Scaffold this active site. Structure first.
Site, PDB file in Angstrom:
ATOM      1  N   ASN A  18       4.638   7.164 -24.332  1.00 34.62           N
ATOM      2  CA  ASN A  18       5.705   7.857 -23.628  1.00 34.62           C
ATOM      3  C   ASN A  18       5.880   9.271 -24.155  1.00 34.62           C
ATOM      4  O   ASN A  18       7.002   9.719 -24.250  1.00 34.62           O
ATOM      5  CB  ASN A  18       7.001   7.106 -23.781  1.00 34.62           C
ATOM      6  CG  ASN A  18       6.913   5.702 -23.240  1.00 34.62           C
ATOM      7  OD1 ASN A  18       6.209   5.393 -22.258  1.00 34.62           O
ATOM      8  ND2 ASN A  18       7.526   4.813 -23.947  1.00 34.62           N
ATOM      9  N   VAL A  32      -9.956  -1.649 -23.829  1.00 42.55           N
ATOM     10  CA  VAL A  32      -8.790  -2.394 -23.338  1.00 42.55           C
ATOM     11  C   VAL A  32      -8.266  -1.698 -22.072  1.00 42.55           C
ATOM     12  O   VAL A  32      -8.907  -0.770 -21.596  1.00 42.55           O
ATOM     13  CB  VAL A  32      -7.700  -2.525 -24.392  1.00 42.55           C
ATOM     14  CG1 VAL A  32      -8.302  -3.198 -25.577  1.00 42.55           C
ATOM     15  CG2 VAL A  32      -7.081  -1.178 -24.739  1.00 42.55           C
ATOM     16  N   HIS A  42      13.477  -5.644 -26.111  1.00 44.26           N
ATOM     17  CA  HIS A  42      12.334  -5.034 -25.497  1.00 44.26           C
ATOM     18  C   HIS A  42      11.278  -6.092 -25.156  1.00 44.26           C
ATOM     19  O   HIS A  42      10.755  -6.078 -24.056  1.00 44.26           O
ATOM     20  CB  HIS A  42      11.775  -4.025 -26.486  1.00 44.26           C
ATOM     21  CG  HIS A  42      10.638  -3.226 -25.997  1.00 44.26           C
ATOM     22  ND1 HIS A  42       9.332  -3.567 -26.266  1.00 44.26           N
ATOM     23  CD2 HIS A  42      10.595  -2.009 -25.374  1.00 44.26           C
ATOM     24  CE1 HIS A  42       8.534  -2.654 -25.763  1.00 44.26           C
ATOM     25  NE2 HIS A  42       9.269  -1.696 -25.225  1.00 44.26           N
ATOM     26  N   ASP A 102       5.230  -8.162 -29.294  1.00 41.65           N
ATOM     27  CA  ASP A 102       6.377  -7.237 -29.154  1.00 41.65           C
ATOM     28  C   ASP A 102       7.479  -7.655 -30.137  1.00 41.65           C
ATOM     29  O   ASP A 102       7.169  -8.111 -31.218  1.00 41.65           O
ATOM     30  CB  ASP A 102       6.784  -7.242 -27.691  1.00 41.65           C
ATOM     31  CG  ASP A 102       7.436  -5.965 -27.249  1.00 41.65           C
ATOM     32  OD1 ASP A 102       8.555  -5.732 -27.693  1.00 41.65           O
ATOM     33  OD2 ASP A 102       6.929  -5.275 -26.351  1.00 41.65           O
ATOM     34  N   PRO A 149     -11.033   2.448 -25.744  1.00 38.94           N
ATOM     35  CA  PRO A 149     -11.502   2.417 -24.385  1.00 38.94           C
ATOM     36  C   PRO A 149     -11.692   1.040 -23.807  1.00 38.94           C
ATOM     37  O   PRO A 149     -11.556   0.884 -22.579  1.00 38.94           O
ATOM     38  CB  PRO A 149     -12.879   3.155 -24.433  1.00 38.94           C
ATOM     39  CG  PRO A 149     -12.833   3.929 -25.688  1.00 38.94           C
ATOM     40  CD  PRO A 149     -11.924   3.225 -26.630  1.00 38.94           C
ATOM     41  N   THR A 193       0.817  -1.179   0.000  1.00 42.76           N
ATOM     42  CA  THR A 193       0.000   0.000   0.000  1.00 42.76           C
ATOM     43  C   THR A 193       0.854   1.232   0.000  1.00 42.76           C
ATOM     44  O   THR A 193       0.326   2.259  -0.271  1.00 42.76           O
ATOM     45  CB  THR A 193      -0.930   0.061   1.204  1.00 42.76           C
ATOM     46  OG1 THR A 193      -0.124  -0.104   2.368  1.00 42.76           O
ATOM     47  CG2 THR A 193      -1.896  -1.009   1.110  1.00 42.76           C
ATOM     48  N   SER A 214       5.820   0.996 -21.589  1.00 45.48           N
ATOM     49  CA  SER A 214       6.085  -0.360 -22.031  1.00 45.48           C
ATOM     50  C   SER A 214       6.420  -1.289 -20.888  1.00 45.48           C
ATOM     51  O   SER A 214       6.128  -2.468 -20.974  1.00 45.48           O
ATOM     52  CB  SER A 214       7.316  -0.359 -22.940  1.00 45.48           C
ATOM     53  OG  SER A 214       6.968  -0.058 -24.259  1.00 45.48           O
TER      54      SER A 214
END
Ligand SMILES: [Ca+2]
Ligand SMILES: [Ca+2]
Length: 279
Positions: free
Chosen positions: A161, A177, A69, A39, A175, A16, A224
């Site tokens: 990013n 996803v 990546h 990817d 929206p 938390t 990512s």
């Protein structure tokens, strides 16, 4: 279970408050779930995947991850040391070349492939797709993500990013996803993270240590990197039977740490992915 001296992101997901270093999680660890990492590929032979990773499709000359990546993302999903869901099954779909780039038609193809391919796999606790990619708005990329989600796969996508409103990026702006923003270890929105009303959730995205090609590890930053934390968490939660692919994003948002983050612009959710683990 408790992994001590865990990467900060994994700790954050089971706490938390910021600043802890142990990752607490249920031993089930996503076993019986499947995550597709769409990817640059996955270095499946990396010892950290313990044989739980496989390449299933490539759109280029090889199925190898020549970039890193995809391997990094996959590692945060489900590597032993660096992963959220340490016993999940990982499937790699190489839609990005070794420079990390790819045409929208290929990315779409890869998403439709997963919607189908999941029917040939044994994933009794459910299927997740982690998409740590994006570019400019495309209604056809969005519609692909929406179809994947509608097929019964929990789709988690990076916000992007650009320190901009994610509404101008795809598939971030779809929206239906689960669009994931990034935070840093001090509970600030990562300086690069997109924001906006389309974000569903934040996860750890700055300085995330994970697997890399050549059997190596490295720390990199991005939305990512946040996305696989959320994808891994979904797999984990589905394995626990707490939620389903259709409602995992919403479950994650509902059970999130709320209000903990800083530099969240008005209109963007202040929700940080949280596993709610109690021993
Ligand atoms: Ca808190
Ligand atoms: Ca959403």
């Amino acid at each position: 279970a408790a992994q001590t001296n865990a990467p900060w992101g994994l700790a954050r997901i089971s706490s938390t408050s910021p600043g802890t270093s142990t990752y607490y999680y249920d031993e089930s660890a996503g076993q019986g779930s499947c995550v597709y990492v769409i990817d640059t590929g996955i270095e499946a032979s990396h010892p950290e995947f313990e044989g739980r990773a496989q390449m299933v499709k490539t759109y280029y000359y090889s199925s190898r991850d020549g970039n890193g990546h995809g391997t990094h993302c996959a590692g945060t999903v489900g590597s032993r040391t660096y992963g959220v869901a340490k016993k999940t099954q990982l499937f790699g779909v190489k839609v990005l070349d070794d420079n990390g780039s790819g045409q929208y038609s290929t990315i779409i193809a890869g998403m439709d492939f997963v919607a189908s391919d999941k029917n040939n796999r044994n994933c009794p606790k459910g299927v997740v797709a982690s998409l740590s990619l994006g570019g400019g708005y495309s209604s056809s990329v969005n519609s692909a993500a929406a179809r994947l989600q509608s097929s019964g796969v929990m789709v988690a996508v990076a916000a992007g990013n650009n320190n901009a409103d994610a509404r101008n990026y795809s598939p971030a702006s779809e929206p239906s996803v689960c669009t994931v923003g990034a935070s840093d270890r001090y509970d600030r929105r990562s300086s690069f993270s997109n924001y906006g009303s389309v974000l569903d959730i934040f996860g750890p995205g700055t300085d995330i240590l994970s697997t890399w090609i050549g059997g190596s590890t490295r720390s990199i930053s991005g939305t990512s990197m946040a996305t696989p934390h959320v994808a891994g968490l979904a797999a984990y939660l589905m394995t626990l039977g707490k939620t389903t692919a259709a409602s995992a994003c919403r479950y994650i948002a509902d059970t999130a740490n709320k209000g903990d983050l800083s530099n969240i612009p008005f209109g963007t959710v202040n929700l940080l992915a949280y596993n709610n683990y109690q021993a």
